[PDB]
Design a protein around this ligand. Structure first.
Ligand SMILES: *C(=C)C1=C(C)[C@@H](Cc2[nH]c(/C=C3N=C(/C=C4\NC(=O)[C@H](C)[C@H]4CC)C(C)=C\3CCC(=O)O)c(CCC(=O)O)c2C)NC1=O
Ligand SMILES: *CCC1=C(C)C(=O)N[C@H]1Cc1[nH]c(/C=C2\N=C(C[C@H]3NC(=O)C(CC)=C3C)C(C)=C2CCC(=O)O)c(CCC(=O)O)c1C
Ligand SMILES: *[C@@H](C)[C@H]1/C(=C/C2=NC(=C\c3[nH]c(C[C@H]4NC(=O)C(C=C)=C4C)c(C)c3CCC(=O)O)/C(CCC(=O)O)=C2C)NC(=O)[C@@H]1C
Ligand SMILES: *[C@@H](C)[C@H]1/C(=C/C2=NC(=C\c3[nH]c(C[C@H]4NC(=O)C(C=C)=C4C)c(C)c3CCC(=O)O)/C(CCC(=O)O)=C2C)NC(=O)[C@@H]1C
Ligand SMILES: *[C@@H](C)[C@H]1/C(=C/C2=NC(=C\c3[nH]c(C[C@H]4NC(=O)C(C=C)=C4C)c(C)c3CCC(=O)O)/C(CCC(=O)O)=C2C)NC(=O)[C@@H]1C
Ligand SMILES: *[C@H](C)C1=C(C)C(=O)N[C@H]1Cc1[nH]c(/C=C2\N=C(C[C@H]3NC(=O)C(CC)=C3C)C(C)=C2CCC(=O)O)c(CCC(=O)O)c1C
Ligand SMILES: *[C@H](C)[C@H]1/C(=C/C2=NC(=C\c3[nH]c(C[C@H]4NC(=O)C(C=C)=C4C)c(C)c3CCC(=O)O)/C(CCC(=O)O)=C2C)NC(=O)[C@@H]1C
Ligand SMILES: *[C@H](C)[C@H]1/C(=C/C2=NC(=C\c3[nH]c(C[C@H]4NC(=O)C(C=C)=C4C)c(C)c3CCC(=O)O)/C(CCC(=O)O)=C2C)NC(=O)[C@@H]1C
Ligand SMILES: *[C@H](C)[C@H]1/C(=C/C2=NC(=C\c3[nH]c(C[C@H]4NC(=O)C(C=C)=C4C)c(C)c3CCC(=O)O)/C(CCC(=O)O)=C2C)NC(=O)[C@@H]1C
Ligand SMILES: *[C@H](C)[C@H]1/C(=C/C2=NC(=C\c3[nH]c(C[C@H]4NC(=O)C(C=C)=C4C)c(C)c3CCC(=O)O)/C(CCC(=O)O)=C2C)NC(=O)[C@@H]1C
Ligand SMILES: *[C@H](C)[C@H]1/C(=C/C2=NC(=C\c3[nH]c(C[C@H]4NC(=O)C(C=C)=C4C)c(C)c3CCC(=O)O)/C(CCC(=O)O)=C2C)NC(=O)[C@@H]1C
Ligand SMILES: *[C@H](C)[C@H]1/C(=C\C2=NC(=C/c3[nH]c(C[C@H]4NC(=O)C(C=C)=C4C)c(C)c3CCC(=O)O)/C(CCC(=O)O)=C2C)NC(=O)[C@@H]1C
Ligand SMILES: *[C@H](C)[C@H]1/C(=C\C2=NC(=C/c3[nH]c(C[C@H]4NC(=O)C(C=C)=C4C)c(C)c3CCC(=O)O)/C(CCC(=O)O)=C2C)NC(=O)[C@@H]1C
Ligand SMILES: *[C@H](C)[C@H]1/C(=C\C2=NC(=C/c3[nH]c(C[C@H]4NC(=O)C(C=C)=C4C)c(C)c3CCC(=O)O)/C(CCC(=O)O)=C2C)NC(=O)[C@@H]1C
Lengths: 275, 40, 177, 164, 177, 164, 177, 164
């Protein structure tokens, strides 16, 4: 009721059973984006590029070294000066101009990817480029995490000049090819996640390249078991060199599945390229 | 807020309609407050 | 006046032609933002009693020659003038953002006030300075990047309407030079 | 999306191929039983406030443990969100009677349901059993036509099947 | 990817609206012309080689600019890319006229199409010329007013689909331009 | 498996590289705190029949709805299997105090736990909360040493974390 | 990738310096706080599945604009993809709190992280709110000022590590704003 | 870089995984033998001008052919660059006693050493044997502690091993 000039702020009272009154407070609720100033000649609004957008100069830089990464890795395939038989890009009949239109469709369909799969493939390829190189550098990933075509041409380029790809390691018995077939079914299930078939296993546009894509692989399926006896023997040791170390870490069951079945662990294709 | 509202005070330039009017009250109705807006 | 729809009429009237298939990607473009165009026009007229009070007080506390004795905001008549005299400019851009064009902003207020502020005394230093304090605060409300009050809206980009709106604000802001 | 349009115009693109008469045949089955499919849609549009309330405490009768603190139903603010949760399942099943397949279910309300609920300590066993209450909750010559319930009931036990 | 039976959801799902009979008469008129849609689109795939015949030929009928060597489209592999490109738009508009909705076009070919044509040196005025010949023969083929080719039909009104195909091809022509 | 042996002898093989002194350093931290790690193992080996029974009806106090027919605990035959189920979790956490990392947990008892339980209509919310009963159920200078509980308690809240 | 035993050398290689005992007392303080950093980071990953679930519930508690239909974050795949991105940043800051150095924070996510989000249409004001909750619960767990959860420790000052985690989420938060 | 931080925080990111107690264990071995590792660093910081000169003409005693024109040591300007070359090897080995592993060696001074030297007609056999002079040049209870030489000597024969 009546005030005094005394100082009792401190002090309490003790009669604080105080579970009888509960109190709170707030404050918050204020995001901020950095916006530009001065009307004469300017006003900028945020835009969706759905891409790398790390410079026009950086974008035209990015396809040049990954062309040089592929031409580095075309020069390990042709280390000795052979266009080696694991790379096949056709059929019996010529049709690599028809498989140009297969690959330029893949040059086009990967360009007309939507904004989820354009952006998901930027970040999964960055950690896969960490998986692609064995060593840990100050250099290699310091290209491969800013630039993504370089990361994409490394997970394609370095892995194709080993022999842990699809259709190149030959299974021994009926037992190996069947679980080789079954792990491909989940790679169908990855690229076909639901009732819609994806745009990216489309492998063709015209009637001529429809059945050309079927007879292209059947000549390349033969050229696995055709080419050698020691490079395909080196494939079954190479098939554990992609699966054990950067695909199934921690699972011993999935580790001895590679060392008991290398050709089944060779079309497991966990590089999610939507194929 | 200042009053109930904030409306245009009538001592501004272009405070009229000025559409199909006479000659003596066109240039009186256009150029309302040019008595000091140019003379200075 | 002309809105954002009446902009594409008169120059296509000037080409003696029809509203063809060329401007269909602009008269579908203003159809899409009209949820968030109408959401942005509400954001300035909500806070406008705090906005013009902040605009005069920030102008006065850094330029104390407006509280000079015998000055432009010295008396209570001349202080209550400028609380209205910079608020009508805030009111006129609130119609101009809703129309999607600043065609109303010239023929209603910008025809005259460059040679009218000096015609009764109001100088060129602080009236340009009174707009820019409203300008960096008008971009904060539409982007929800204020410091003290966070408006609960949906998720989306607002730089496209910020490079719009600034135009109206600043156009009147200059004008006075 | 997921319909017969997502089958045959996508497989002809996946073959790089014309819309041949395999693709033209598959949509004829839409036409003869869209009248079978689309008097079921206005039932749960007519009962969009009726059967959300009868499914919540039918679930909360057989799941009555939730009302303690520290669980998924500790206050009415959870239950105010809980009738939102069954209705958001109920919105999508109405839309799958329109698109034919389970189009709005899988890409919006099914995929990754098994990464959310018990991480938010929400019981998934109550989620299928609230739906399995409404699965048998039908009467085919009395509520709707006899040609309407077999699209409805096959989507509701699918919701238990898709959580499996 | 998307059809007219799922164009009508993503408005209602966005406002959380259960679809009832206020809008199901639009699909009742769309399941009305079910066989009528099939009777239209059987007549475009029947002579679908003949429409890619008449289009690029009528394109080189009007323009002898491309056939000059040193031009864009004079040679046969480049014309093979042309007669790839000419049927693929024809292959894709058949899907949209099947679906009753243009979204199956709108991601699979219109995504990034015109800037690849100026990355390759394709003149786009010849493209909107050639799709206009494709547009002009398709409306004769869904109807019964060709020169020689007359299929058996049940007669009646077919102009609602004729407005649909005429709103489909120019949307492709709005993409390449 | 999962240990520091699974890190450095596998990464040197993944680099195609010698066991250099980065790999020789990583196992030294085993040696100075295996004595910290391996008086915790004989506690739950000494209490391998003691704390299985005290965790089951501490879970079944806060999950007492199970005893109706048609659910996960409809008879004692379920409860005879249920003390097997917590002990089979409890076997592996004992082994992870020996191998260092969570070696026997992930490849045997963790991966694909979210494909099993509510498909068998077993509640996953009771599974983490039976474990979260035992997570805080410790007393670090009294039951074991103070250097022993921080390996134990970090594995038990991991079991709620690995089900997330 | 890089840590506090390597941040001390990388500037000295720009000047080709032999490292001496003039800077190792910073590292002698770092090797002093070996178990003290280790008694911090175990308490982060003890309960961080609760930390992800506390953050994006409380971010929805302040803003129901995401859960509204037509919003960015409202459906079930979308929340699972939200709970994906909600974990991955907590996974990364624990690496830098293990490192004593946020180089591993920068290159692995923050290169272009900010405007992939508006390449997806993800609201960046909601991102800084959710990680501010993850800022606030993280210091309560590397101290003993949680609500119920009191882990076993030995007593002493840990505010130097609490300032080190204070320099971490805002480096993300400035790299997403 | 190359340390135990480059093992376990990278492998948990390569697994997409938490810093579990496999990762928290691996750095404990730094702590108990950093005192073993970091009185070796100020030895070759204290002898950063002492043992560069004693290794050059110990190498140039057993490689004395270089002083003719047309070779790698044709003038003193080569030898003024040659004491720079052994010291630039000697800088990095000092830094690997600090980071634990061979961090500054491989990404800066080891990788692609076999693309440089005999292309610049520099003999690689003198490069390992100048280092192998300094490899056995130690005395473990007299120069440093007994816990300090086994990090030093294992890095110097590694320099012959990494050139192999
Ligand atoms: C919605 C209306 C709403 C919430 C949901 C809830 C979320 C929330 N929590 C905090 C602050 C903290 N949250 C913490 C998390 C936990 N505490 C625990 O003991 C368990 C292990 C865990 C929950 C799963 C912690 C430690 C804090 C710090 C303070 C405290 O001890 O409580 C906030 C505020 C964040 C901030 O401070 O900016 C929010 C929103 N609260 C709600 O209001
Ligand atoms: C794995 C081996 C390899 C190397 C090296 C390489 O550069 N490409 C592969 C296989 C390969 N393919 C060819 C030959 C041709 N390829 C084409 C189609 C090209 N046109 C295109 O539009 C594209 C997509 C970018 C391609 C590849 C054509 C027309 C030929 C001509 C050969 C012929 O039958 O006349 C070659 C051989 C030539 C070459 O150096 O590329 C190789 C090795
Ligand atoms: C990081 C510096 C590691 C390291 C890695 C190694 N990389 C090796 C070969 C190699 N490196 C690259 C990336 C780089 N080289 C290029 O030519 C280009 C771009 C044009 C880049 C970005 C590639 C592509 C290759 C393979 C082909 C090649 O040799 O150029 C390498 C040799 C063995 C191997 O191939 O793996 C190593 C050891 N080196 C280090 O020490 C740090 C730790
Ligand atoms: C081992 C217990 C791991 C682990 C395994 C999981 N893998 C999952 C899916 C998956 N795993 C692989 C690799 C492996 N599985 C195989 O069947 C074969 C070959 C015969 C191999 C090498 C693949 C290729 C796939 C995708 C489809 C498939 O199952 O085959 C999985 C399910 C969740 C997921 O999709 O990742 C688990 C749980 N996960 C672990 O936590 C431990 C370490
Ligand atoms: C305008 C575009 C056409 C035209 C269209 C009409 N079609 C009519 C009836 C009709 N068409 C079919 C065949 C259709 N059903 C199929 O299952 C398949 C392929 C597997 C196809 C091509 C049938 C079976 C019917 C009768 C069923 C019905 O629609 O009622 C029709 C008249 C409807 C009627 O007679 O009641 C029209 C106008 N007809 C034309 O003359 C132009 C060229
Ligand atoms: C996308 C990942 C695919 C799945 C799933 C699949 O099964 N095939 C991929 C694309 C695809 N292709 C068709 C139809 C054809 N595909 C052809 C190429 C394939 N044929 C082959 O012999 C081989 C190598 C083994 C391949 C890849 C051809 C030829 C056709 C048929 C053209 C024709 O004669 O009609 C389909 C649709 C399958 C169906 O019958 O519905 C899909 C999805
Ligand atoms: C009440 C009868 C239920 C129950 C409901 C709760 N759900 C909660 C959150 C939640 N629910 C879903 C699934 C549902 N919501 C959707 O928005 C959609 C799709 C459009 C679906 C299928 C999601 C995805 C979420 C998280 C985001 C959100 O809040 O919407 C919830 C709140 C949990 C909490 O905040 O702690 C409740 C109470 N819970 C039950 O146990 C009974 C069975
Ligand atoms: C010829 C009468 C046309 C014309 C055609 C051209 N298209 C050219 C390249 C091209 N176009 C596309 C888009 C379209 N074609 C497809 O194959 C697909 C699907 C994958 C689509 C959407 C692509 C993808 C490409 C590149 C691969 C290809 O050739 O198919 C092109 C350039 C060839 C040249 O170098 O001469 C031409 C001429 N352009 C015209 O002016 C008329 C209208
Ligand atoms: C009782 C306190 C629990 C409860 C337990 C049940 N678990 C049942 C089956 C089951 N449990 C597991 C996980 C566990 N068992 C193992 O063998 C291992 C690893 C070695 C672990 C982690 C599995 C894998 C299975 C299926 C195979 C099996 O039966 O062992 C179960 C029987 C269910 C039934 O038959 O219907 C019960 C009752 N259930 C509860 O709700 C409370 C929380
Ligand atoms: C501040 C962030 C914390 C806190 C830190 C302290 N920890 C102290 C002692 C300590 N902690 C551990 C265990 C640690 N080493 C490991 O190898 C592992 C797991 C693999 C862990 C968790 C040990 C062994 C010690 C004693 C050795 C030592 O650090 O001296 C401590 C006391 C320091 C001292 O007594 O000298 C502090 C302040 N403690 C807190 O209260 C907050 C929450
Ligand atoms: C003298 C005892 C040696 C010898 C030394 C020479 N090295 C020459 C060039 C050179 N050396 C290296 C390796 C070294 N230098 C570095 O900067 C670093 C890393 C920081 C290392 C490990 C490099 C990379 C180069 C080329 C670039 C450069 O000049 O630094 C050199 C000059 C050769 C010339 O210019 O013709 C000499 C004389 N040569 C010998 O044969 C004895 C054994
Ligand atoms: C068929 C189930 C049995 C018979 C009679 C019953 N009719 C009942 C009707 C009823 N159903 C509902 C919910 C209903 N509304 C919906 O929108 C949907 C799903 C899309 C459902 C299932 C309501 C609110 C009623 C009462 C009002 C009415 O009659 O419409 C019913 C359930 C119990 C009840 O509430 O009456 C039974 C039983 N007759 C038979 O021969 C069948 C055994
Ligand atoms: C520390 C928790 C508080 C204090 C005293 C208590 N001691 C208790 C002991 C107790 N604990 C168990 C289960 C125990 N055995 C195990 O193997 C494991 C896990 C590996 C655990 C937790 C049992 C059966 C007892 C009773 C017999 C005994 O004392 O050993 C306890 C729990 C309640 C009880 O049963 O006695 C408390 C409380 N003292 C303090 O200062 C701490 C607050
Ligand atoms: C151990 C090698 C034998 C014994 C005696 C010796 N002591 C010698 C000492 C010596 N060492 C150096 C170089 C030294 N300084 C460094 O920084 C490093 C490497 C990091 C080294 C090896 C120098 C300049 C001396 C002389 C001055 C001193 O004593 O410190 C040595 C080498 C010959 C010499 O110069 O004296 C021998 C031999 N005693 C034993 O029992 C061991 C057999």
């Amino acid at each position: 009721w009546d005030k005094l000039l005394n100082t009792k702020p401190m002090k309490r009272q003790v009669q604080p059973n105080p579970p009888t009154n509960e109190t709170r407070a707030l404050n918050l609720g204020n995001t901020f984006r950095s916006p530009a100033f001065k009307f004469l000649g300017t006003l900028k609004r945020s835009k969706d590029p759905s891409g790398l957008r790390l410079g026009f100069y950086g974008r035209k830089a990015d396809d040049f070294m990954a062309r040089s990464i592929a031409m580095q890795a075309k020069a390990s395939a042709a280390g000795s000066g052979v266009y080696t038989t694991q790379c096949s890009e056709g059929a019996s009949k010529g049709m690599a101009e028809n498989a140009r239109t297969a690959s330029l469709a893949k040059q086009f369909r990967q360009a007309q990817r939507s904004a989820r799969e354009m952006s998901f493939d930027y970040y999964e390829g960055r950690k896969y480029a960490m998986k692609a190189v064995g060593h840990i550098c100050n250099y290699e990933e310091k290209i491969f995490q800013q630039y993504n075509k370089t990361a994409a041409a490394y997970v394609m380029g370095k892995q194709e000049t080993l022999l842990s790809c699809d259709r190149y390691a030959q299974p021994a018995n009926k037992a190996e090819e069947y679980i080789q077939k079954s792990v491909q079914m989940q790679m169908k299930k990855r690229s076909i996640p639901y009732g819609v078939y994806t745009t990216s296993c489309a492998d063709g546009t015209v009637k001529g390249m429809a059945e050309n894509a079927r007879v292209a692989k059947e000549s390349a399926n033969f050229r696995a078991r055709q080419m050698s006896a020691g490079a395909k023997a080196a494939a079954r040791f190479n098939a554990r060199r992609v699966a054990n170390d950067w695909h199934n870490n921690g699972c011993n069951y999935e580790e001895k599945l590679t060392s008991r079945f290398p050709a089944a662990a060779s079309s497991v294709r966990p590089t999610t390229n939507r194929y | 807020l200042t009053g109930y509202d904030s409306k245009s005070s009538p001592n501004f330039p272009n405070r009229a309609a000025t559409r199909e009017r006479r000659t003596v009250s066109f240039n009186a109705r256009v150029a309302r407050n040019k008595s000091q807006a140019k003379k200075i | 006046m002309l809105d954002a729809f009446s902009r594409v009429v008169v120059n296509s009237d000037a080409k003696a032609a029809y509203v063809g298939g060329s401007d269909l990607q602009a008269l579908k473009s203003f159809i899409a933002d009209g949820n968030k165009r109408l959401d942005a026009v509400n954001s300035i007229v909500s806070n406008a009693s705090c906005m013009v009070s902040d605009a005069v007080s920030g102008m006065i506390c850094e330029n104390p020659g407006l509280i000079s004795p015998g000055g432009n905001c010295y008396t209570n008549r001349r202080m209550a003038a400028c609380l209205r005299d910079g608020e009508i400019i805030l009111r006129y851009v609130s119609y101009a953002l809703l129309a999607g064009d600043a065609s109303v902003l010239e023929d209603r207020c910008l025809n005259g006030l460059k040679e009218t502020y000096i015609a009764l005394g109001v100088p060129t230093n602080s009236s340009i300075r009174a707009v820019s304090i409203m300008k960096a605060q008008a971009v904060a409300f539409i982007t929800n990047t204020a410091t003290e009050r966070k408006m609960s809206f949906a998720a989306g980009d607002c730089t496209s309407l910020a490079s719009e709106v600034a135009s109206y604000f600043d156009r009147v802001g200059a004008a006075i030079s | 999306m997921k319909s017969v349009i997502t089958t045959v115009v996508s497989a002809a693109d996946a073959a790089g191929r014309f819309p041949s008469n395999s693709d033209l045949e598959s949509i004829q089955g839409n036409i003869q039983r869209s009248a079978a499919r689309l008097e079921a849609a206005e039932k749960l549009a007519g009962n969009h406030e009726a059967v959300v309330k009868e499914a919540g405490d039918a679930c909360f009768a057989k799941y009555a443990y939730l009302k303690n603190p520290g669980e998924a139903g500790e206050n009415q603010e959870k239950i105010n969100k809980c009738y939102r949760d069954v209705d958001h399942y109920m919105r999508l099943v109405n839309y799958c009677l329109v698109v034919g397949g389970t189009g709005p279910l899988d890409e919006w309300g099914i995929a990754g349901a098994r990464e959310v609920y018990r991480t938010l300590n929400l019981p998934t066993s109550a989620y299928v059993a609230s739906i399995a209450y409404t699965r048998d909750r039908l009467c085919v010559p009395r509520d709707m036509s006899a040609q309407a319930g077999v699209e409805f009931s096959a989507y509701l036990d699918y919701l238990i099947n898709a959580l499996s």
